[PDB]
């Protein structure tokens, strides 16, 4: 049974700085500077900041565009899943990714989603019904405060998820932390559907916040250290100084 849970507030913005870099492929490299072209969140971009405070719970339907950078900071594990699709109703196949205490369930079905879907661990009040599914996958859960970052890409039918989890110190401004951390590949799902919109699923029973950015086709120079770990990167289309650094292959 769908339950209609509000006012609409204007968005906040935060400074992305140097974040959103992920390993472009599954190839070991070390002690080398590698130039690659792929979809990355632009350096020093403007990222949309949403709030979950409890009396406001931001969970709007957002565009997916060409890929989404998603991040959240919390302790109570309020953000537990995502919905990806087009019309997000019984007319088309949609992707539902939901985490719980023991596992993660990923399935693609013609879901009739609720006007304001959520989880309620007294159970799913995400959809009222579902028809014939095309994809099923079950594995281990994907999910000082916990900083969780994800990259969602949809290329040639493959829904690629990258992720990173680090502990962060609490700062009063409650902004994005500075520093460099690369995202490792998590899962690659052979689904084959058209994602144009997505929505964040919140679990009810605290405070949390999340950020949304969009990826662009850009050229990056990635620095691999002795242990094949990416420790730095240059956005070759940010400014004239970065352009020179990329040309000369030097940080």
């Amino acid at each position, epitope marked *: 049974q769908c339950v209609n849970l509000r006012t609409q507030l*204007p*968005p906040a913005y935060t400074n992305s700085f140097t974040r959103g870099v992920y390993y472009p492929d599954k190839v070991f490299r070390s002690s080398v500077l590698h130039s690659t072209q792929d979809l990355f969140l632009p350096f020093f971009s403007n990222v*949309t900041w949403f709030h979950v405070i409890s009396k406001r719970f931001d969970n709007p339907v957002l*565009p997916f565009n060409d890929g989404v950078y998603f991040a959240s900071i919390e302790k109570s594990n309020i953000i537990r899943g995502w919905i990806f699709g*087009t019309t997000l*109703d019984s007319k088309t196949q949609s992707l539902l990714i939901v985490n719980n205490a023991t596992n993660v369930v990923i399935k693609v079905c013609e879901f009739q989603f609720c006007n304001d879907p959520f989880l309620d661990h007294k159970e799913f009040r995400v959809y009222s019904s579902a028809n014939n599914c095309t994809f099923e996958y079950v594995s281990q859960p994907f999910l000082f405060k916990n900083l969780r970052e994800f990259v969602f890409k949809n290329i040639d039918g493959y829904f690629k998820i990258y992720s990173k989890h680090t502990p962060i110190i609490v700062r009063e401004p409650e902004d994005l932390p500075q520093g460099f951390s690369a995202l490792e590949p998590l899962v690659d799902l052979p689904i084959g559907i058209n994602i*144009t*919109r997505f929505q964040t699923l919140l679990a009810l029973h605290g405070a949390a916040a999340y950020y949304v950015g*969009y990826l662009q086709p850009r050229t990056f120079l990635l620095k691999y250290n002795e242990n094949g770990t990416i420790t730095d990167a240059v956005d070759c289309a940010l400014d004239p100084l970065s352009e020179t650094k990329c040309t000369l292959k030097s940080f």
Partner: antibody, heavy 120, light 104 residues
Framework: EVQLVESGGGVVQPGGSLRLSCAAS????????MHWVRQAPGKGLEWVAF????????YYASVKGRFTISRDNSKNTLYLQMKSLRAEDTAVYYC???????????????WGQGTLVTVS | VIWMTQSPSSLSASVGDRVTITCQAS??????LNWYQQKPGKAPKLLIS???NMETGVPSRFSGSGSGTDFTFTISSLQPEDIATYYC?????????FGPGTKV
């Protein structure tokens, strides 16, 4: 509140040019695509142009080759540059964010007030 | 380019009457049709999306249905506040197009 404000209208001569602009606020302008739609007195709605969120791909209607669509995401401003204007282009020009599950992905439908452009 | 047409171009109805407007597309656009209502001097307002989905805040007296090329917009009981020009718009592919408009 979400508000789209057109400006730059007025009266021009045939063969001349005019640059219109739309100021956006109250929403994440830089993540959405935008459309231009015009309506001449006595007529229905006519679609003119569309630009993607990244200011990359551009599409045009009757106007292709004469009108140029562009945007600046640092100013939250949408622009339409009209060259070689004709008498038939007299209309009220609106900027809009049209609900679209296939291309822009917008889940919300927004319209401005419109600005009048007269060619004579 | 997809052609859009509507019928009748104008209709006369009283308060309490049932009003139906037909939209037809020259090409199959599945379920990607928007319905707009425009009052004189105002920008168009969206009432129905994806053929049959109602927008939030739209009165229950409004409805619509259809798929492919033939779509219908219905007012179950016309109100004095429902006097406007109704337009259908397709967004299956670019360029997007609007119909002629129906005068109620």
């Amino acid at each position: 509140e979400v508000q789209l404000v057109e400006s730059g209208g007025g009266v021009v001569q045939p063969g001349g040019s005019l640059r219109l602009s739309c100021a956006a606020s109250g929403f994440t302008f830089n993540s959405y695509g935008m459309h231009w739609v015009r309506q001449a007195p006595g007529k229905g709605l006519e679609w003119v142009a569309f630009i993607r969120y990244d200011g990359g791909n551009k599409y045009y209607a009757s106007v292709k080759g004469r009108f140029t669509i562009s945007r600046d995401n640092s100013k939250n401003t949408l622009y339409l540059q009209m060259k070689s204007l004709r008498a038939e282009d007299t209309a009220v020009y609106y900027c809009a964010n049209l609900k679209d599950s296939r291309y822009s992905g917008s889940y919300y439908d927004y319209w401005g007030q419109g600005t009048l452009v007269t060619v004579s | 380019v997809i052609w859009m047409t509507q019928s009748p171009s104008s209709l006369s109805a009283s308060v309490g009457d049932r009003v139906t407007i037909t939209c037809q597309a020259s090409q199959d656009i599945r379920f990607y049709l928007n319905w707009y209502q425009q009052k004189p001097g105002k920008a168009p307002k969206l009432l129905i999306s994806d053929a049959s989905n109602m927008e939030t805040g739209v009165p229950s007296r409004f409805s619509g249905s259809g798929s492919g090329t033939d779509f219908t917009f219905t007012i179950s009981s016309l109100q004095p506040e429902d006097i406007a020009t109704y337009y259908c718009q397709q967004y299956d592919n670019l360029p997007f197009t609007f119909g002629p408009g129906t005068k109620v």
